[PDB]
Each structure stands twice: as structure tokens, then as C-alpha cells.
Design a protein around this nucleic acid. Structure first.
Ligand SMILES: [Zn+2]
Lengths: 49, 96, 169, 48, 169, 49, 345, 48
DNA sequence: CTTGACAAAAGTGTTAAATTGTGCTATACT
DNA sequence: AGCACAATTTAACACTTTTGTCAAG
């Protein structure tokens, strides 16, 4: 569940990163960030009741 | 807590107990010297070290924090006297 | 010196606030990112609230109990106990006057009871939704003359103020 | 909050109900609701 | 002259003659109808309170904003080198940014729309400092859903300056 | 006695607690297998049974 | 909701067609050049007459009385320059009117492009600064973009504007977002660091080490420097941060006070001063006086050598020998009583 | 895999995501060098 | 109690390095 | 994003005064 939440935030990050830079050539490496899912899972494991 | 080398919390219910007994100076020490009062606890420890009876405290010092906090809310807090006159609990401090 | 047998609470006038004030905090910093000293006009500033060290000013010119109460000529730090930072209060002079949210939001709203304004309409005024009429100046709206205390939205304000026009493409 | 646009209404209310991603009704809920109301359901969505 | 906001309210409150309203509400009070009577009563109660208090109603609209001493809202590093600070510091800070931004925007000659918006943000900032969360969503530190704790929250609550730190220790 | 430079920060076992030393752990930075948070040189941990 | 309020408020004022845009820009520039020509007329500065005209435009009495309690007097320095500009022939007059109209055009242009700014600020969230703050910084950047714009270049104003709004919002993150003040340079530095770290974390499949990230940063970058910048980058912690599942505890009230003397410490200092005072009294009067002149036991300051020699009328060397002797006598009596052998920490 | 609809550009390319904690044999995880456990939650089943 | 001779410590005035603050960029973009 | 330049702070450094001490009176 939390994984898919973080995945949604990552989806939004991807969506923000498309409309700028060079829409012609972009590798998925530049399009994707670790922190949304990383911090989602981190938050769930450390914090959640 | 113990880990912090802490003192025991004296609750409101315990205050009610002391009041029910009618012990004024015990409750006074609890509320001033033995808890947060700076000059009170200092002069007290001094007195016991020198073998005196501990003096009478003045300012709990959390109450002064309460006063200045109330003033931060733009509420004028005046501590008066027997005859309706200003008594400054901050001694030459915030007087300006 | 004297006993305190009485404690009162009242509204502090702006003048009283300024009287309490040792100075205004202009700059919204806390401390320098490295030196960790209070910033010039910042919230933790010593030039108003007092020194971090007892009798020691910021620059370190006047160093002792010998000098007392004398303001240092560079930092402007008063030589005194470092405890005054708990007592001495600052202030922020506001450009446009604002309302204390207590007398607004309180269950029997006080300013609303005084001026005879409902919580709703007063909420609309204070948060700048609808203008209110202090001086009508013989103005009229929809056949009925506008009087004091009356609330108008942006449209009607602009209408009775700047006039009414129609643009046709 | 936003002006009553038609396409905004379409997209929003598609994301509210008909969206399989945004709206996922439990497989157990799918099954149970299917065997309670006396009907059947294609997907996990309230509407299609 | 139709003004929107705390300025206008302040002006009305200053214009108020409490003696006029005193006599007038006293007369309004003996009206046979019960509703009008009781309403006039509560109104006259606030009015009389202001009368024998000596306090002026316009004080409820704040010009100068009192700033709490640094040691009361401390900022200090701990073991590990990392810092720590009160929420009141951040609240005060944001109030300062908005107040200064508006301060330079007024002198700028900026249009009425921007001025109005920043002024509204200023009211909500002052209120966020006084009592946070009562009006609209509580202002929280970015990335955290934990509401910032204001002066009102310092005084009241089970953990308030009274219950936790005063009536018990 | 020369007033000297550095002061003593040493870790001393809390009151009410005491025992024998079994485990010894030293993680120093600039050494393999360990990444320590910024600003911190080394962490030293002691097991006491 | 304030956001709804402002968004609707700017929703009221419509957009501007190319005609309107060009015309407004034209009228603005005409206004400015009119101000310059008026500067050649009465011989006063541009911003002077400009701010006067504004004072006649964007409000009557409200521009003067509250940009702080003190600026330029209403009946005096405003009205006299007003009346001085009033007393000119026809051309300078029509140029006065033109200037005013220019100012108004500036205002409207600002509004439509406030809609623009709202879009841009909508792009920038996540900051460490709230939405409306972003909007307002962007709006100032907008007034800025309006001022320096040139329509003669035949470019749509939107682009030039966008750059300025963006830079203004970045000025916001630099000047605002962190509780502690971190100036622009290290902000950009930290940003580059984090960005690169993300990149090579994507490449390597794991987080880097200070060495490899420093090498990836280019020349002048080592482990200590990236560690230091990262040490600056970290934010303070809220004192009200909850501790444990308990609702009765904060983080801040677990912080001790080392600034304030403990009762044991005050008593310690007291006993030290007293015992030292009594251990001093067995000395000769002069040597004791000299010692307490050296220590700061009198005025708190430190009286050197020559000063003591000047006060007692003797040479400084004598003072030196005196204090040494005193020290050793105290060595004896203290070697006896062992009252002051403590306080050695 | 990343694609372009209009271009027909196919750049597939692998990527990273993050770090995922693994459950031990006893059934507990380890977070920041501390053994922790995730308790099962009880709510009402989906459906109507 | 004294004096003169000396270097180490603490001062005092001009400079270099790095440090911080401010402004600017133009396909269009609301 | 990032650079460039002005204004500014720090640390840099070269030569001065006194402050502490040594030795011998
Ligand atoms: Zn000073």
C-alpha cells in the first residue's frame, strides 16, 4: 500500500520532469528519482504505528 | 524519568492532597523552592549546606515565563500590591 | 520591597507594547549558519534582548561587572546579566494594522458584539472579501441608499466608486 | 473551488469512481458485494 | 470611502463613543420585546466592560506585535551537533517575511490586488502566530503534518503552562 | 596546574547500572565497511552484561 | 481559503490580446520618457516625479502614512512638488498626464501577468515555503519583469516575464526555506551536490561515499568538503517533535540548561571564594592586596605588573617576587589544612 | 521501458528504485540496527 | 626594594583571499 | 541553472609597544 503511494509520488515526479529539458532525448534514468519510494518506505517502517 | 536523572512529578491531585491537609509551607516548597525556583533552590541548598533553615522563596520563575508569554499575546499582566500599585517581579531586568 | 496581593489582566495598547519593546526585530533570520551568533536584526538578537554571556558584550570590549548598564558602542549590547534574554521583549511594527484573532474567533465575538457585526460578515471584512462603508457620501445602490456598516463585494464597490461600463466585442 | 468546467467534471469524476487505479475496491469486497446484492461486477470500479 | 479589513474595523472601533452606545442601548433595553432586550443586554455588557476597564476597543486591532524573549523560545544545538528550535520562531519568522514583503510592496506602488493578497496573508500570519489552527488548515512545517504550536496552545491544553508547569511540578 | 585546552567528555556508566565488559565495537570514519553521518568522526559502543 | 480568494480575484481580470499588450508597453515607455523629459523640465530626478505620480494614482493618503511611520511628509514635500509641477506650460502638462496613464497601464499589465505568475508559482511547490509566498515573490519578480521589458524586440512578454518570475522564486528558496539563513552560493552548491548524488545513486545502484561523490563533483572537491557542506545543509529539529507514543512529552523539554548555574555550582563557587578569602588573610596585607589586584578580585579586571607598581609606588619586579612568595606561603598552609586542596576538578 | 508514441523512439534502459527492507526468518525486520515488527491490523471488509 | 637588558606576548595598520549579496538572461508559457 | 561583479568580512601579514622574566645589584 505505502509502496504504491510512494510510487504515485514518483509518478508525479516523472510527470513534472517531462515538460522541461529536452523532450526529444531523455533516458528513464533522468526521468526517475529514488527519494519518493525510499522516503515512503522509510516513513512506513520507522514511523507508522 | 530515571534515565535523565529526573525528579518525581508532583501532580495536581497531590496538590489537592496537600491542600486538603492544610500544609501551606510544604505545598510552598513543592511549588517553589524544591521544584523550579532558581534563587529559592540555590539559597536553600546554600542554607542547608551552611546549616540554616531555608529562606522564603519569591518567584517560581515558570510564572514569569507565563507572564511574558501572556504579554506576547498582547495581554497586559500587572502584578499589583495591597493598594493597587505596580510591583515589578523582574528586578531591574525588563524594566527599561 | 512590597507584597503582591493582586494580579490583574487587561488589553495592552500599542504604546504599551512599544514600551515593553527593547527594539523591533526587522530581519527574519535566527543565527548565522556558521558562527551561530544572533543575526543583526534577527529574532535572537543581543542588541535588544540582551547578551548571551553575563556582563560580556557581543564584541567583547566591556568585559566585567565593573561596567554595568552601559551600552557598548559597536554591538549596542547592554552590559548586564545574560538572564535578561528571558524577560526583555521585542516587537514587529506592522505595515497595515491587523486584528488579534481572539476577539474575532471567540464564541461570543467581542468586536462583533461591539460594532454589531455577525461572525460571518466580520470574517468577510477582516479577511478582505467584501468592503465596508464608513462614509457613504450620498451614494445609492439598486434604489436603496447605501449607509454605514453596509458590506459590498468588489463589483458594487468598483461600481459606486469608478462607475459602471459595458464592453462589447 | 474551480470553475464548473465540463472536461474538469469528466476527468475528476472519472478519477473518483470509474478509475481502476485511483479507485480500487477490494477483491474480497468485489466478491462479497457480488454475492450479496444478487448481481455481478466486471471490475473493481463503482462505474465504468 | 469603503474600506476592507482590520484598518476599517480599527477606524470604526476608534470612532465608537461608548457613552453614546451606553445611553442608547440602555434606552433600547426597556423595549417590551424580549429578543431585542437580551441582545442589547449582551452588547451593553461588552460596552460597560470596556467602560469601567478603561481599555480602548481599538487596541483589539494590533499595530505593534509583541515578540517573546529568545530564551523563552530557545534555539540550541544538542549532542551530535544538530540543532533544535521552537515552532514559535518559525511562526514569528514567516510573519516577518510577509510583513516586510508587504512593507516594500506598499512603497513599491504595486497594484491593489497584490497589496490586498499580501495583506490578507499578513492577517492570517499574525493569527497563525497568536492562535494556530482555529481558522483554516493549521500552518505546519514543510514535509510534516504536525501543526505548529502557538502562544494560545502554550497557555491552554492539558499540557498548558498552567496544568503541566504551574499547578503541578 | 596548567589550565589545559581540552575538557573531559568521557562516557561514564549511569547510576544504578554496572557490570562486566563483554563486547567491544569501534567504528571510525575513513575505514571500509562503514559510512558515518557528516560531522562525526567515530562511534564507540560497549556491551555491558 | 485564501488561495481560492486570490485565484478568483485574478480570475476576475481578463487576459490581454497582442494589441493590448503592445499598446500598454508603448504607453508605459512613453510615460517613462515623459518623466525624463520632465526631469529636463523642472530639473528633478526620475524616480522623484515617478513616485509623486504614483502617490497621485495608486492611493491618495495611503502611500505616504504607512510604509513605516516616517517617509516623505504629506502636506509638505509631496504637495509642494505637486504644485511645482502644476505650474508649467502646456507640453510638460500633457506629458504629466501621459506619465500617469503610463503608470496605470503598468498596473493592468502587472495584473494579467499575475495570472501568469500564479501558473509559474504553481510549478514550484515542495519548497520549504508556502504556495502564496511563492505567488508573491513571483509577483514582485513580475513587477520587475514589467519595468525592464522592451516591446520593440517583438518578443511575447510572457517569456521574459517567466525568467524573472522563476529567478524571484529561486531567490525565495535561497532567502527563506531554511530556518537558519543559508546564502545563495552554498544553496546552489548543496543543490548540485544532492543532484549529482541522485545521479550516481541511479548509476551505481547504491548511495555513494564522500570520496566518489567528491570526484564526481570535479576539481577542488574532497570528502571533507562535501561532508562539511552536508553538515551545513541539515535543518534544525522542532522542539515540539513528539517523543515515543506518549502524548505527554516533547523533544525540547528533555534539553538541560548548562547556561544557568546549578545550586551545587553556586554553593561551590561560594565556598571557593570564602575559603580562598580566609586562606588569603594569613598573608601580609600588601601581598594579599597585590594578589587580589592580579586576580580580578577587586574590579574584576586584570592589573598587570606596572599597574600594581604604579598604585603602590614601587617597581614591577618587586610585585613579581611578592606574588611568588605569597603563592608558596599558601602552599605551606594549604599543605596543612587540606581545605582548598579540592576545587581541582 | 520508455517509449515515444509519435516518434516511435524506443529507449528501454533499466533503472533503480530504492532500498526495500527484507523480513527475516523469524518474521521481523531490522530498521536502523533495531529489530522491529509490523503488527497485523483489523478493520472491516470492503464491500457494501 | 631596584635597574637594565630581552624576548615573548599582545597590538596595530595595510592587504590578500574567500565570502556574501544583488542582478541579469528575450520562441513561447497566463 | 549558473555566472559575474560589487560590497564585505575574515585571515593574513609585517612591524610596534609593553608585559614577563632573568640576572645582578
Ligand atoms: Zn561591545
Amino acid at each position: 500500500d505505502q509502496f504504491r503511494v510512494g510510487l504515485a509520488r514518483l509518478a508525479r515526479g516523472v510527470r513534472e520532469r517531462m515538460v522541461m529539458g529536452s523532450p526529444d532525448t531523455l533516458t528513464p534514468a533522468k526521468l526517475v528519482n529514488s527519494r519518493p519510494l525510499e522516503a515512503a518506505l522509510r516513513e512506513f517502517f520507522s514511523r507508522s504505528q | 524519568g530515571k534515565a535523565q536523572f529526573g525528579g518525581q512529578r508532583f501532580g495536581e491531585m497531590e496538590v489537592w492532597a496537600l491542600e486538603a491537609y492544610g500544609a501551606a509551607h510544604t505545598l510552598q516548597e513543592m511549588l517553589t523552592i524544591k521544584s523550579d525556583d532558581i534563587e529559592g533552590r540555590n539559597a536553600a541548598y546554600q542554607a542547608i549546606i551552611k546549616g540554616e533553615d531555608v529562606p522564603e522563596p519569591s518567584v517560581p520563575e515558570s510564572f514569569r515565563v507565563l507572564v511574558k508569554e501572556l504579554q506576547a499575546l498582547a495581554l497586559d499582566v500587572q502584578t499589583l500590591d495591597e493598594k493597587d500599585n505596580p510591583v515589578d517581579i523582574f528586578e531591574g531586568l525588563a524594566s527599561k | 520591597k512590597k507584597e503582591v496581593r493582586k494580579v490583574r489582566i487587561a488589553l495592552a495598547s500599542p504604546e504599551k507594547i512599544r514600551s515593553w519593546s527593547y527594539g523591533e526585530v526587522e530581519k527574519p533570520e535566527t543565527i548565522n549558519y556558521r558562527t551561530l551568533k544572533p543575526e543583526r536584526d534577527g529574532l535572537f538578537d543581543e542588541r535588544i534582548f540582551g547578551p548571551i554571556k553575563d556582563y560580556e558584550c557581543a564584541c567583547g570590549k566591556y568585559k566585567r561587572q565593573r561596567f554595568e548598564g552601559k551600552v557598548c558602542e559597536r554591538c549596542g549590547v547592554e552590559v548586564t546579566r545574560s538572564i535578561v534574554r528571558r524577560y526583555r521583549m521585542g516587537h514587529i511594527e506592522l505595515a497595515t494594522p491587523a486584528a488579534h484573532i481572539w476577539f474575532v474567533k471567540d464564541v461570543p465575538s467581542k468586536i462583533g458584539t461591539l460594532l454589531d457585526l455577525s461572525a460571518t460578515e466580520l470574517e468577510q471584512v477582516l479577511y478582505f472579501n467584501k468592503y465596508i462603508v464608513l462614509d457613504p457620501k450620498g451614494a445609492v445602490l439598486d434604489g436603496v441608499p447605501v449607509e454605514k456598516r453596509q458590506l459590498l463585494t468588489d463589483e458594487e464597490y468598483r461600481e459606486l466608486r469608478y462607475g459602471k461600463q459595458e464592453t462589447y466585442p | 473551488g474551480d470553475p464548473p468546467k465540463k472536461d474538469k467534471a469528466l476527468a475528476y469524476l472519472f478519477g473518483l469512481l470509474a478509475d481502476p487505479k485511483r479507485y480500487d475496491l477490494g477483491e474480497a469486497g468485489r466478491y462479497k458485494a457480488e454475492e450479496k446484492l444478487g448481481v455481478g461486477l466486471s471490475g473493481r470500479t463503482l462505474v465504468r | 470611502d469603503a474600506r476592507m479589513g482590520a484598518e476599517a474595523i480599527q477606524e470604526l472601533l476608534k470612532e465608537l463613543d461608548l457613552e453614546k452606545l451606553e445611553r442608547e442601548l440602555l434606552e433600547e433595553m426597556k423595549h417590551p420585546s424580549r429578543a431585542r432586550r437580551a441582545k442589547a443586554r449582551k452588547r451593553l455588557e461588552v460596552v460597560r466592560a470596556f467602560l469601567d476597564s478603561g481599555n480602548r476597543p481599538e487596541w483589539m486591532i494590533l499595530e505593534a506585535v509583541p515578540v517573546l524573549p529568545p530564551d523563552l523560545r530557545p534555539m540550541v544545538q544538542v549532542d551530535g551537533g544538530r540543532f533544535a528550535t521552537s515552532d514559535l520562531n518559525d511562526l514569528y519568522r514567516r510573519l516577518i517575511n510577509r510583513n516586510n514583503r508587504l512593507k516594500k510592496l506598499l512603497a513599491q506602488g504595486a497594484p491593489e490586488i497584490i497589496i490586498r493578497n499580501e495583506k490578507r496573508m499578513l492577517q492570517e500570519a499574525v493569527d497563525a502566530v497568536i492562535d494556530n489552527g482555529r481558522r483554516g488548515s493549521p500552518v505546519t512545517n514543510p514535509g510534516s503534518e504536525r501543526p505548529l504550536r502557538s502562544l494560545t496552545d502554550i497557555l491552554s491544553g492539558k499540557q498548558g503552562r498552567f496544568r503541566q508547569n504551574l499547578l503541578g511540578k | 596546574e596548567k589550565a589545559r585546552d581540552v575538557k573531559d567528555t568521557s562516557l561514564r556508566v549511569p547510576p544504578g547500572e554496572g557490570g562486566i565488559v563483554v563486547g567491544r565495537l569501534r567504528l571510525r570514519r575513513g575505514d571500509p565497511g562503514v559510512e558515518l553521518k557528516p560531522g562525526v568522526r567515530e562511534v564507540v559502543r560497549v556491551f555491558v552484561a | 481559503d485564501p488561495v481560492r480568494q486570490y485565484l478568483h480575484e485574478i480570475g476576475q481580470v481578463p487576459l490581454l490580446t497582442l494589441e493590448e499588450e503592445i499598446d500598454l508597453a508603448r504607453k508605459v515607455e512613453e510615460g517613462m520618457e515623459a518623466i525624463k523629459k520632465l526631469s529636463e523640465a523642472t530639473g528633478l530626478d526620475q524616480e522623484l516625479i515617478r513616485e509623486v505620480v504614483r502617490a497621485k494614482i495608486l492611493g491618495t493618503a495611503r502611500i505616504q502614512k504607512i510604509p513605516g511611520l516616517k517617509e516623505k511628509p504629506d502636506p509638505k514635500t509631496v504637495e509642494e512638488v505637486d504644485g511645482k509641477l502644476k505650474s508649467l506650460p502646456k507640453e510638460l502638462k500633457r506629458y504629466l498626464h501621459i506619465a500617469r496613464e503610463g503608470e496605470a497601464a503598468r498596473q493592468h499589465l502587472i495584473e494579467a501577468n499575475l495570472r501568469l505568475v500564479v501558473s509559474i508559482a504553481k510549478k514550484y511547490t515542495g519548497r520549504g515555503l508556502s504556495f502564496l509566498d511563492l505567488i508573491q515573490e513571483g509577483n514582485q519578480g513580475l513587477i520587475r519583469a514589467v519595468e525592464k521589458f522592451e516591446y520593440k524586440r517583438r518578443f511575447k512578454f510572457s517569456t521574459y516575464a517567466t525568467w524573472w518570475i522563476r529567478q524571484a522564486i529561486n531567490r525565495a528558496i535561497a532567502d527563506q526555506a531554511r530556518t537558519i539563513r543559508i546564502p545563495v552560493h552554498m544553496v546552489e552548491t548543496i543543490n548540485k551536490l544532492s543532484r549529482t548524488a541522485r545521479q550516481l545513486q541511479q548509476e551505481l545502484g547504491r548511495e555513494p561515499s564522500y570520496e566518489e561523490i567528491a570526484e564526481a563533483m570535479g576539481p577542488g572537491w574532497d570528502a571533507k568538503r562535501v561532508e562539511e557542506t552536508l553538515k551545513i545543509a541539515q535543518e534544525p529539529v522542532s522542539l515540539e517533535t513528539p517523543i515515543g507514543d506518549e502524548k505527554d512529552s516533547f523533544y525540547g523539554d528533555f534539553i538541560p540548561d548548562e547556561n544557568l548555574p546549578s545550586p551545587v555550582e553556586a554553593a561551590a563557587q561560594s565556598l571557593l571564594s570564602e575559603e580562598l578569602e580566609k586562606a588569603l588573610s594569613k598573608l601580609s596585607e600588601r601581598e594579599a592586596m597585590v594578589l587580589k589586584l592580579r586576580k580580578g578580585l577587586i574590579d574584576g579586571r586584570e592589573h598587570t605588573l606596572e599597574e600594581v607598581g604604579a598604585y603602590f609606588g614601587v617597581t614591577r619586579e618587586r610585585i613579581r617576587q611578592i606574588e611568588n612568595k605569597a603563592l608558596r606561603k599558601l602552599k605551606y598552609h594549604e599543605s596543612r589544612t587540606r581545605k582548598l586542596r579540592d576545587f581541582l576538578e | 521501458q520508455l517509449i515515444h508514441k509519435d516518434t516511435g523512439l524506443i529507449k528501454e534502459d533499466e533503472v533503480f528504485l530504492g532500498h526495500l527492507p527484507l523480513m527475516t526468518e523469524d518474521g521481523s525486520f531490522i530498521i536502523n540496527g533495531a529489530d522491529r515488527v509490523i503488527v497485523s491490523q483489523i478493520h472491516r471488509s470492503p464491500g457494501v
